Design a protein around this ligand. Structure first.
Ligand code: ANP
Length: 312
């Protein structure tokens, strides 16, 4: 019924995810054959957390940020078509490994820093950074996924954010996350909501015996309860610990920002549709996030993966 529309462009598969706001299905984009993940929201039962996520993602274009391809609103649904990340949540990857060496943690964490730092460079704060919100793509690289709370879980929430006293609070979070990567459990936890608050406000947590002193100092600079004493985003990029084994700062700028429309891609579409090239060109530049945008973008994903730009 609400599905009549989507079923035009995609073949639906199994639910691969459930959040509090959305059910998320593996689907295949019929025209290009590419796998995608679609986030399905009931407009009735919930709030405009959605308007935020979509406003955000249309403005964030980055190798570590999940790409948005297509929005469709129905009589009752909003459907969001995203880059499919077959790797699984980062949370799930810790669970199986127990915890990560510092070397692997660096590799991973530098990608979180890249994404978050680029997010801040655009004027936003994610505000809900945590492992369940970082997914591994087909290349095993991380993609950040969940932007309902982008601004222009309580265990990850900075003490000043708990207090209502945005960017520093992402550092805090990224600090809770680094802890989780290295030790494989939360720095602060408790069955009781307010007891867990107390813990977060005290900022005192276990320091496991496998952490290198560089690690432990890092944690201590990120996990400063007082925001004003917290490592700023700027020196996180080139901290000694961050640079170990790499010796350059984190590369946070977009390696693939929007410069020109793709030469080759405009062509496969005006060829497939039998449409004047120039009208095809002109209509892509509407950036509507309709099935036209989708097909275009998904054909760039073919290019970035080194696949032929072809339509079946
Ligand atoms: N791009 C994707 N590729 C593969 N799986 C995804 C993708 N986006 C979401 N999922 C899966 O489904 C879950 C729900 O997605 P998510 O955006 O977190 O849902 P949400 O309800 O809007 N927000 P939340 O309450 O914070 O979970 C995720 O944690 C993933 O496991």
């Amino acid at each position: 019924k609400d599905y009549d529309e989507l079923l035009k462009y995609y073949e639906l598969h199994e639910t691969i995810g459930t959040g509090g706001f959305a059910k998320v299905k593996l689907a295949c984009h019929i025209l290009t054959g590419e796998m995608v993940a679609i986030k399905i929201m009931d407009k009735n039962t919930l709030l405009p957390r959605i308007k935020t996520e979509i406003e955000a993602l249309k403005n964030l274009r980055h190798q570590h940020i999940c790409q948005l391809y297509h929005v469709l609103e129905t009589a009752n649904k909003i459907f969001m078509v995203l880059e499919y990340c077959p790797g699984g949540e980062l949370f799930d990857y810790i669970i199986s490994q127990d915890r990560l060496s510092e070397e692997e943690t660096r590799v991973v964490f530098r990608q979180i820093v890249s994404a978050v730092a680029y997010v801040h460079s655009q004027g936003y704060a994610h505000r809900d950074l945590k492992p369940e919100n970082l997914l591994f793509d087909e290349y095993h690289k991380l993609k950040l996924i969940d932007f309902g709370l982008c601004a222009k879980s309580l265990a990850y929430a900075a003490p000043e954010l708990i207090q209502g006293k945005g960017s520093e609070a992402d550092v805090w979070s990224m600090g809770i996350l680094l802890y989780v990567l290295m030790c494989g459990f939360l720095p602060f936890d408790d069955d009781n909501v307010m007891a867990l608050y107390k813990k977060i406000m005290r900022g005192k947590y276990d320091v496991p015996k496998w952490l290198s002193p560089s690690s432990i100092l890092l944690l201590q600079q990120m996990l400063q309860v007082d925001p004003k004493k917290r490592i700023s985003m700027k020196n996180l990029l080139n901290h000694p610990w961050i640079m170990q084994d790499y010796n350059y700062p984190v590369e946070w700028q977009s390696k693939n920002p929007f410069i020109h429309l793709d030469d080759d891609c405009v062509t496969e579409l005006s060829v497939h549709h039998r449409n004047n090239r120039q009208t095809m060109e002109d209509l892509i530049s509407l950036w509507q996030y309709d099935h036209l945008t989708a097909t275009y973008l998904l054909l760039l994903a073919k290019k970035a993966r080194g696949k032929p730009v072809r339509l079946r």
